[PDB]
Write a protein that binds this ligand. Structure first.
Ligand code: ATP
Ligand code: ATP
Ligand code: ATP
Ligand code: ADP
Ligand code: ADP
Ligand code: MG
Ligand code: MG
Ligand code: MG
Ligand code: MG
Lengths: 52, 186, 250, 267, 101, 51, 241, 261, 65
């Protein structure tokens, strides 16, 4: 959660979590230099993790 | 193959043939939206196409340029719009639209409205037959069902492209692209 | 919406009252206002008919079907459930009483056999309750004129007066005020017309109104005269013209 | 309702004369005269339930009383009470009762409450919890609202069993009026009379034939008929509507479904 | 529901005829007294169902004096008032049932 | 009902006025109280009246 | 909803399934017409003219069930065929059982009873076709019985079916009031067909060729389909309007 | 300028039907007053978007020469009151001066709510703007001289209140253009732009049955792309034949065939 | 039925029984169809019944009506 699941699904909903989530996806996705950066992700369940 | 052929009708051909468009008088394509599954190379296409059209390629994301507060940033975005139109010809690639889509009734009247409105303005101004040919617009989004309802009214994005599932042919070619990097094993 | 237990008819409902059975009643209400009044010397049943399409023939829509020549039925509800139920009533009765006891049923027995059919379309899962609730009005020798209601549940009750359909509320109270069993039949027919006339006032013409009596025998309509001992038909259905006569007596 | 007041007066009420009388005695008169009630010594008449399905002019009755009271009229709807922040609803109950005290005498009128008042509820939805709380506080405030200059809560419903009957009940609501919508001859006759007054009619056909032919027709059906009738009257340049024109206008509008549209598929 | 800390519980019945006599008596005294003192009769004859019921009887009996433009009640009025209040309570509460059992 | 009045009196008035008497003569102190019975009895009224 | 699917009583107590069948029987858009002449029963249906890949003639909506009895079908074709079997079949069985030709009225009653059984069957989905039987009946003479997908059935003086049914009905209604009877005028079997052809053209507003219609005619002891060219003999006077 | 009443096709019929409703009570409330009926105000239009409900509102306004205020409310849409509060007050004031006047309230549904009871709480805030407008235009007062025509495009965002009598008197259908109403439209479009002479539309209109007029403009433009691709500045009848097929696919797929309540 | 009478010969028991059993079906027919059955209809139904048992059920009848 936070940079994990969207809270858009709710009735009033929220998208401060979509901002955080989005930013991370784009840094990973496409060209962008890296200095041998390993990416480790700890999720209790893959289900909760955004499918994106 | 198919999507490339389609994008090239919407984009490349009008760019060079712009005189012809003026004469006949019909609008030239006012932007293409690509949507459906990721991994289909929405990215990629736009880069190659822009280069052919020799038109400055901005890779851009409308909520990413909101830095901290939506006070100092709503205003930043009005500048970004201004900059991007100027120094044409150009193809501005605006990406993921989901955070500012907000089809809901609890759609923010905050500064999130301002980014969104200036999205409508960009597209409206391209209509005509001279403004469409210089300034070109690509847009990328994944879910297409969460958008603003004023976007499904009129022809705000003048062309809508759904990605199809890959074929056998499509898979076999993508593998070849990857395998070349590796040692060739027959 | 409701439970999966209450849609099922093999499953005890939480309440214990099926959703199903309750649907059957909602539909009864939606139909025509049909009534029955019991008299000393007769029973009158009367109802209005669906106007349907303009060019659809009204005559062929029959909401009173004779079960036997001496016992008729009236219903509120749907046509399809009515006809199928009706073939079953006659058929089960022949087997269990016209070959065994070689005679027409008592009204009570016929009413009993109609409940059982009903009951089985509610017991067996996956088979909806009959879409129709009856009045079975009739005449037999042993227990005289008789008046019944048979519920799509398969419970039945005798009454002094009952009415069913949308206008059930209205009608029942009117009958009370104006009439009691001890009064003669002739009075009730005029009364019943008036009662049904509250229901609808645009047309009350004898074409759209089906009115019948079960009363005295008609030895003419026995149809094999020269033998007198056999009871004639108890039931006599009154034509439109006959209705119109009865409208000027009101 | 006084800043700009309705044009509905007790005179502008046509039919329902019998229903209309009881409602004035209950509501309008505690406010104009406290003094009458004090001399005998009774507790003023309490709330008034208005039910009868829409077209029975429940709201219309209260439009009449709004002019004559010369004094506050607070007209609110059920929408206001149900959530506006997911928490606004409990607060919103309290404010109408307080606001009434300030500008007393006041008529409290709540148009919809059929959806606020339900026997059962669902606490699993978060938004619903506020619906539940509004219902319970209303019961509480009403007991603390007796013996006030404000009339005890007036509300309008489609039905009297939408409200809980054990809880909301006589002696909160000691007058509970059913309106005729099946309607009698007299009741019909008065509604036709509002129209008959409004513009002269050129007799060209029986007036009373039309009444009898209306099975139960409500006020709204009768207004609609005239509206068509007069659209034809413009073209002709007629300015007094033929009784023949009304007859044909009735013929083309055989409302309340009749037989021709209900009967067609309930067969 | 479950144990915790709730312990005392007080049960309130709807009134009996004795209790009904008491509630009815004291409101009538404050208002205008029932003449012929048949407020006792009214309670003996029937039970209401609530003390809310009883205050409704009080209001109506008094309203009957108002229609005549009198300011005092009698027994004749209570006998009308009771039948109206009490019967209305029954016709609103029974309608929900169809014809089961 | 006065049945009711004696039963409620014991429970609220004596431990509030003097906890010191109640405690000693009895054992413990009474807790919350739940009033149950139909609407329209005038339970609310009782609660106001003791206070 | 689950409430839509259950074959057993809906919460409304009036089936969703039944309303659905009613939707279906207007997918094909066949306007049909059936009237009763004096001694002749005329049934007309649009014969669609598809592409050459299909033959036009073969395409039909009028079918000969038995002697005298014809059937016009409105609503989808594969379900039409399913129904058709059962009706042809019973006419035969009745003749075996009872040693006389089945009357019209009795065949329609049988099929209403089968319709109702379908919603009692869980597996089965109710047939979503209109069966309108036309005949010169044994006793009653010209007869029209229209059967609904639900299983309601009712007789008719005249009828039309389709999405554009409404326009045709009006003409037929007013006609019958001026004529002051329920039969289309003229004893002659031939000119009643033409009065039907003409009234179809009027209502719909579209002139139809022989290609665009099919005309089935009931006489005493046969139901038979006219030639393509027979239709034309009528059509020609009418066609100049 | 008047939108040419000839260039409205397949809804010719609509224009004429309309003036009964509009022209007679707008010019003279006198006739309806003497006749004996309350004068009608509130007219609801409805058709699948791109049949030109807006276009028809304009057509009528020019004929009479009555003042015309077209306000889209989807251009100012917000939750709580802000910018909307300023506009609507201004807008009635202009309408009053230029009376007789027609307000074509376009996408009334935009600031339109849905009542809910357990829904999003925000939609009721949106609804309030619409109610403020209603009272300004007409209160208890009934004028024909200033009149309101309400046009909707989405029906499930449309306000249940605004359906009722007392806000509304006629519910006027605007249906699909005609079969060869669509042909009239097709031909007009191509006359405007360059063409070498095209007459393949007799075939083309048939495939493109069920089209909104908006959608016909789309096959004409794509045909035109095809011409420029061929290196011509003239649409050839071949190019047009190509376009109508592909455009017909999407059009029905994603089609609006709704008629709003 | 009222206008279909027959007189029976053969085994007496069978003649009464067959008339009673068949009687019902004819009565069923009448009401089902809202029409008086054909004389031939009775004839047909009668014939098949007997035929099955190859005549052990020994009713030989004059069918009139
Ligand atoms: N069509 C393609 N052929 C081969 N590799 C592909 C293709 N599309 C994407 N990939 C690979 O996947 C990587 C990530 O692309 P990504 O999943 O971000 O795709 P996208 O369609 O641009 O989506 P989004 O921006 O919504 O995440 C690329 O850098 C490329 O190596
Ligand atoms: N194992 C235990 N330890 C302590 N007291 C116990 C035990 N088992 C039973 N009790 C008895 O239960 C009495 C009341 O416990 P109390 O109700 O305060 O407890 P709890 O389980 O903390 O719950 P809650 O806060 O919901 O009331 C104690 O005073 C004592 O008599
Ligand atoms: N015994 C009484 N004496 C006086 N008035 C009474 C009596 N009982 C009830 N009433 C009247 O009935 C009104 C409503 O009853 P109240 O709301 O106090 O009931 P309750 O039984 O505590 O119900 P709830 O279920 O709403 O909590 C009181 O405000 C009062 O006017
Ligand atoms: N006394 C009457 N005279 C005329 N018409 C009436 C009368 N009373 C009610 N109506 C009709 O009832 C309809 C509803 O009135 P309204 O006050 O809007 O309330 P509701 O629908 O809530 O009962 C109107 O169409 C009105 O014409
Ligand atoms: N009747 C018509 N005649 C000509 N073109 C039409 C017609 N109907 C629709 N169109 C075209 O579609 C365009 C857009 O429809 P628009 O006026 O925005 O209507 P709506 O309010 O129904 O969405 C019109 O401006 C016009 O170009
Ligand atoms: Mg990407
Ligand atoms: Mg109301
Ligand atoms: Mg209480
Ligand atoms: Mg518009």
């Amino acid at each position: 959660a936070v940079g994990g699941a969207r809270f858009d699904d709710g009735a009033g909903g929220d998208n401060e979590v979509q901002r955080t989530m989005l930013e991370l996806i784009t840094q990973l996705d496409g060209f962008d230099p890296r200095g041998n950066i390993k990416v480790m992700f700890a999720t209790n369940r893959p289900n909760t993790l955004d499918p994106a | 193959d198919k999507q490339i052929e389609e994008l090239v009708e919407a984009i490349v051909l009008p760019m060079k043939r712009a005189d012809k468009f003026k004469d006949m008088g019909i609008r030239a394509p006012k932007g293409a939206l690509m949507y459906g599954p990721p991994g289909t190379g929405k990215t990629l296409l736009a880069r190659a196409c822009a280069a052919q059209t020799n038109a400055t390629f901005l890779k851009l994301a409308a909520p990413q340029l909101v830095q901290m507060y939506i006070g100092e940033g709503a205003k930043l975005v009005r500048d970004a719009f201004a900059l991007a139109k100027e120094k044409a010809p150009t193809i501005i690639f605006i990406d993921e639209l989901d955070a500012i889509g907000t089809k809901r009734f609890d759609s923010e009247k905050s500064g999130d409205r301002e980014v969104q409105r200036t999205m409508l303005e960009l597209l409206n101004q391209l209509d005509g037959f001279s403004s469409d040919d210089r300034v070109k617009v690509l847009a990328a989004t994944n879910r297409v069902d969460v958008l603003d309802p004023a976007l499904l009214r009129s022809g705000r994005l003048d062309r809508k492209i759904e990605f199809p599932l890959p074929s056998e042919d499509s898979r076999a070619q993508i593998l070849q692209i990857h395998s070349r990097k590796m040692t060739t094993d027959d | 919406m409701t439970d999966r237990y209450s849609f099922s008819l093999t499953t005890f409902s939480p309440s214990g009252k099926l959703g199903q059975i309750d649907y059957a009643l909602t539909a009864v209400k939606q139909g025509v206002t049909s009534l029955g009044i019991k008299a000393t010397n007769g029973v009158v049943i009367a109802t209005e008919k669906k106007s349907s399409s303009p060019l659809a023939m009204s005559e062929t829509l029959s909401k009173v079907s004779l079960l036997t020549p001496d016992i008729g039925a009236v219903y509120s509800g749907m046509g399809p459930d009515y006809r199928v139920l009706v073939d079953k009533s006659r058929k089960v009765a022949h087997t269990s009483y016209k070959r065994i006891y070689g005679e027409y049923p008592p009204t009570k027995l016929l009413v009993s056999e109609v409940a059982k059919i009903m009951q089985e379309a509610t017991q067996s899962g996956g088979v909806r309750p009959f879409g129709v609730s009856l009045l079975i009005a009739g005449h037999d020798e042993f227990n005289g004129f008789s008046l019944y209601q048979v519920d799509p549940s398969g419970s039945y009750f005798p009454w002094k007066a009952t009415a069913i359909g949308k206008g059930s509320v209205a009608a029942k109270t009117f009958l009370e005020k104006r009439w009691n069993d001890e009064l003669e039949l002739e009075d009730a027919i005029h009364i019943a017309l008036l009662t049904l006339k509250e229901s609808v006032e645009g047309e009350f013409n004898g074409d759209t109104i089906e009115l019948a009596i079960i009363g005295d025998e008609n030895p003419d309509l026995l149809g094999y005269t020269g033998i007198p001992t056999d009871k004639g038909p108890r039931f006599r259905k009154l034509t439109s013209q006959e209705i119109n006569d009865r409208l000027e007596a009101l | 309702g006084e800043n700009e007041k309705p044009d509905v007066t007790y005179a502008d009420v046509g039919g329902l004369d019998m229903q209309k009388q009881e409602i004035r005695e209950a509501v309008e008169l505690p406010l104009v005269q406290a003094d009458l009630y004090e001399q005998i010594g009774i507790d003023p008449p309490r709330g008034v339930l208005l039910y009868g399905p829409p077209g029975t002019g429940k709201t219309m009755l209260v439009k009449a009383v709004a002019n004559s009271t010369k004094a506050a009229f607070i007209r609110v709807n059920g929408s206001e009470f149900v959530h506006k922040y997911l928490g606004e609803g409990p607060r919103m109950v309290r404010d109408v009762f307080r606001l009434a005290r300030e500008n007393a005498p006041s008529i409290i009128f709540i148009d919809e409450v059929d959806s606020i008042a339900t026997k059962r509820f669902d606490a699993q939805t978060g938004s619903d919890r506020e619906v539940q709380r509004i219902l319970i506080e209303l019961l509480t405030q009403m007991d603390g609202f007796d013996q006030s200059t404000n009339v005890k809560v007036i509300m309008a419903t489609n039905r009297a069993d939408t409200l809980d009957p054990a809880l909301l009940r006589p002696g909160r609501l000691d007058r509970k009026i059913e309106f005729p919508s099946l309607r009698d001859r007299r009741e019909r006759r008065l509604i036709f009379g509002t129209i008959a007054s409004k513009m002269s009619l050129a007799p060209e056909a029986d007036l009373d034939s039309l009444i009898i032919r209306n099975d139960s027709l409500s006020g709204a059906v009768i207004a609609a008929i005239m509206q068509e009738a007069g659209l034809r009257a413009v073209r002709k340049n007629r300015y007094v509507i033929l009784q023949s024109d009304l007859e044909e206008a009735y013929a083309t509008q055989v409302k309340t479904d009749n037989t021709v549209d209900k009967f067609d598929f309930y067969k | 529901l479950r144990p915790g800390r709730i312990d005392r519980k007080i049960e309130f019945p709807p009134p009996s005829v004795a209790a009904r006599a008491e509630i009815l008596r004291i409101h009538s005294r404050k208002m205008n007294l029932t003449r012929g003192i048949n407020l006792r009769k009214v309670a003996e004859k029937m039970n209401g169902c609530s003390g809310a019921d009883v205050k409704g009887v009080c209001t109506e009996a008094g309203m009957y004096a108002l229609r005549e433009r009198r300011i005092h009640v009698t027994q004749e009025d209570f006998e009308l008032a009771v039948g109206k209040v009490m019967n209305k309570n029954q016709e609103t509460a029974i309608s929900v049932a169809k014809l089961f059992k | 009902l006065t049945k009711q009045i004696k039963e409620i009196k014991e429970v609220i008035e004596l431990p509030v006025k003097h906890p010191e008497l109640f405690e000693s003569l009895g054992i413990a102190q009474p807790k919350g109280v739940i009033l149950y019975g139909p609407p329209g009895t005038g339970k609310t009224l009782l609660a106001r009246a003791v206070a | 909803g689950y409430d839509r699917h259950i074959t057993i009583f809906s919460p409304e107590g009036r089936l969703y399934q039944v309303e659905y069948a009613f939707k279906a029987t207007n997918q094909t858009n066949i306007n049909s017409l059936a009237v009763r002449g004096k001694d002749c029963t005329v049934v007309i249906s649009q014969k669609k003219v598809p592409d050459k890949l299909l033959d036009p003639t073969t395409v039909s909506y009028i079918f000969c069930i038995s002697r005298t009895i014809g059937m016009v079908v409105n609503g989808p074709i594969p379900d039409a065929r399913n129904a058709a079997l059962r009706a042809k079949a019973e006419a035969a069985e009745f003749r075996y059982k009872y040693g006389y030709d089945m009357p019209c009225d009795v065949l329609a009653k049988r099929m209403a009873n089968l319709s109702q059984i379908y919603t009692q069957r869980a597996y089965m989905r109710p047939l979503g076709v209109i069966l309108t039987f036309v005949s010169v009946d044994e006793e009653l003479g010209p007869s029209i019985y229209k059967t609904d997908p639900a299983g309601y059935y009712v007789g008719y003086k005249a009828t039309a079916t389709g999405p554009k049914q409404q326009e045709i009905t009006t003409n037929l209604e007013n006609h019958f009031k001026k004529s002051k009877i329920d039969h289309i005028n003229e004893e002659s079997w031939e000119k009643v067909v033409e009065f039907a052809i003409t009234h179809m053209i009027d209502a719909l507003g579209t002139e139809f060729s022989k290609n665009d219609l099919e005309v089935g005619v009931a006489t005493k002891d046969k139901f038979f389909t006219l030639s393509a060219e027979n239709i034309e003999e009528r059509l020609v006077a009418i066609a100049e309007q | 300028g008047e939108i040419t009443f000839d260039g409205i096709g397949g809804l010719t019929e609509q224009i004429r039907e309309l003036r009964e409703v509009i022209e007679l009570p707008l010019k003279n409330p006198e006739i309806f007053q003497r006749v004996g009926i309350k004068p009608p105000k509130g007219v609801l239009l409805y058709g699948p978007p791109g049949t030109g409900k807006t276009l028809l509102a304009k057509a009528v306004a020019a004929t009479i020469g009555a003042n015309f205020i077209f306000s889209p409310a989807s251009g100012i849409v917000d939750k709580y009151i802000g910018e909307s509060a300023r506009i609507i007050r201004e807008m009635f004031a202009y309408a009053k001066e230029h009376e007789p006047c027609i307000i074509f309230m376009d996408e009334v549904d935009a600031i339109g709510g849905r009542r809910f009871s357990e829904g999003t709480s925000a939609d009721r805030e949106i609804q309030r703007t619409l109610m403020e407008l209603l009272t300004q235009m007409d209160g208890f007062d009934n004028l024909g001289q200033t009149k309101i025509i309400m046009a909707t495009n989405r029906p499930d965002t449309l306000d249940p209140a605004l359906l009722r009598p007392g806000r509304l008197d006629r519910k006027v259908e605007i249906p699909l253009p005609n079969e060869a109403g669509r042909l009239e439209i097709f031909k007009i479009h191509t006359a405007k732009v360059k063409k070498t002479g095209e007459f393949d539309f007799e075939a083309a209109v048939k495939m493109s049955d069920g089209f909104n007029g908006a959608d016909i403009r789309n096959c004409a433009t794509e045909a035109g792309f095809f011409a420029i691709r061929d290196d011509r500045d003239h649409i050839n009848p071949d190019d047009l034949m190509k376009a109508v097929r592909k455009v017909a696919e999407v059009k029905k797929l994603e089609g609006t065939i709704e008629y709003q309540k | 039925s009222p206008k279909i009478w027959c007189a029976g010969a053969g085994t007496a028991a069978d003649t009464e029984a067959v008339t009673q059993l068949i009687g019902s079906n004819i009565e069923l027919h009448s009401l089902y169809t809202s029409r008086e059955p054909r004389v031939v209809s009775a004839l047909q139904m009668l014939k098949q019944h007997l035929f099955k048992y190859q005549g052990h059920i020994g009713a030989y009848l004059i069918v009139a009506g």
